[PDB]
Amino acid sequence: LYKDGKMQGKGVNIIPVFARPDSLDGTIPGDQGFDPFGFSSWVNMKFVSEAEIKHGRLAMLAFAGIMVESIGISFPGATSILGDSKDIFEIHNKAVESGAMGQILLWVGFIEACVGVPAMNEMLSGETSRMPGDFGFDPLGLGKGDKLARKQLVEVTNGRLAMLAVSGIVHHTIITGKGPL
Amino acid sequence: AKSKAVPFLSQPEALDGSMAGDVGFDPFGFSSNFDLKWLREAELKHGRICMLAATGCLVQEVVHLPGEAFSQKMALNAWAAAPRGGMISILVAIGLIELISNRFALTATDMFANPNRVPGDLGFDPLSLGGNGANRARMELAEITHGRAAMMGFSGMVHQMLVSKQAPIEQLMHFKAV
Amino acid sequence: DFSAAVPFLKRPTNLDGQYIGDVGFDPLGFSDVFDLRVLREAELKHGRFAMLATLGFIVQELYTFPFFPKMAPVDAHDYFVKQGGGSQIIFWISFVELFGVVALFETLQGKREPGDFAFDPLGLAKDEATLERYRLAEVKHARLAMIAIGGFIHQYWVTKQTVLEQLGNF
């Protein structure tokens, strides 16, 4: 549920030592009154909202991949070329040298350039009334009327938590030399 | 009342957001002493030459014409190694392109004498890609942004070739600190 | 009537309290002959240079970049004269100082405050009163750091020690 005035909206501040700015409208999902540096006063809110959502989804996929590749789950035949170890950095370097990550880079960049760049440009220019992070992708049909929130808010919160989790896991792998779990 | 690019300076006069790329950035007051049409024509010309020049500095390393004289990967060697009569022909052809393309109005006193002459509008549209009205302002903004980026990039590549004696891409692959 | 700081000196006539931090201290009468906008721009530029210099003297001995050799900051000036980094820093300071010249010319016309460079990307001053307070804090820290940088460099010149090792013994 949208819980405007409890979880989002005007008047909600989760870290009350930094007062809620007047710049935040409360329309954006995840607006919980945290802008100490006042960035919302001068940036375009739609662009940074879509950037936060895309960074969050990338960090979710990164967390899922890091945990399944550091625990030991692998595809059939995937261990041989990419090394029978569990260290994510060496997995990156081996899969680059194999050519897998160039192929991933090519297709992710093709997806980014072909529809992502026009979606961001038309969304910012005001030609489609497209919302940030809305790429119209609902294959399984799980949000129809619950899209207002209990889908958006939980996604952005898990995105931010995934960002913090992936950063923590990477810097632990740097300092310790051993992957998580 | 203040410039948007430089917020501690007042907005330069005759700059009102009409031209493409106008963010009010003129701290030295060049537009307060010289006319904006000549400045825009000069900016577009420097930028377009630097677009072609940056593309050349990147392409000549990967692709060469056949022959010994065109086999220098570093562009400052290709300036000297190329046949001299060809480069003098290039100079003369650039002079002719300047002469006819500006329609014999070449100076600071006769270019823009015709009121229909627009800064950077030489009439050049060989494939007529500008036949669309709402694209136009975005197109000029993209052109001037590509030109400015190309000017800064080509300056950096030429002086880095001077420092390193290396062609740009293999200088990025075979980097040696100063 | 009299100056607020020095009770036996008269208040300087051009020190009317329009600039934050004014306590009527100008016994030589520098504000009686010279433009106070120029003097305040010079004061703030010298003070900001001194604040950055004192912070550099603390941090640059606490930490040193791996891609540089280790030495004292006074010897670092002479070293970076010859390596070339000091020339780069002087060049970029001069490049910013050209627009500082333009900003000073805007100040002399009264269209710009003698300390306003409109640089607040973190939005730290929301309303007026906090900005007035931060001006008083900046001016006081500027004067303090102007004294403190001369202290740091002259104490290195006499003891041949950096600040933090002089703190540990004598």
């Binding site: 680059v96 040298e97 | 293999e170 990025l172 692959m173 075979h174 980097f175 040696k176 600190a177 | 891609f67």
Partner: peptide
């Protein structure tokens, strides 16, 4: 020259390798 962007051991010292060695010293 048949080498990579980063982590090269041989006759290939890229700008990224120079950055990495500058941090790792």
């Amino acid at each position: 020259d048949g080498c990579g962007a980063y982590a090269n051991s041989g006759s290939c010292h890229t700008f990224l390798d120079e950055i990495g060695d500058a941090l790792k010293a």
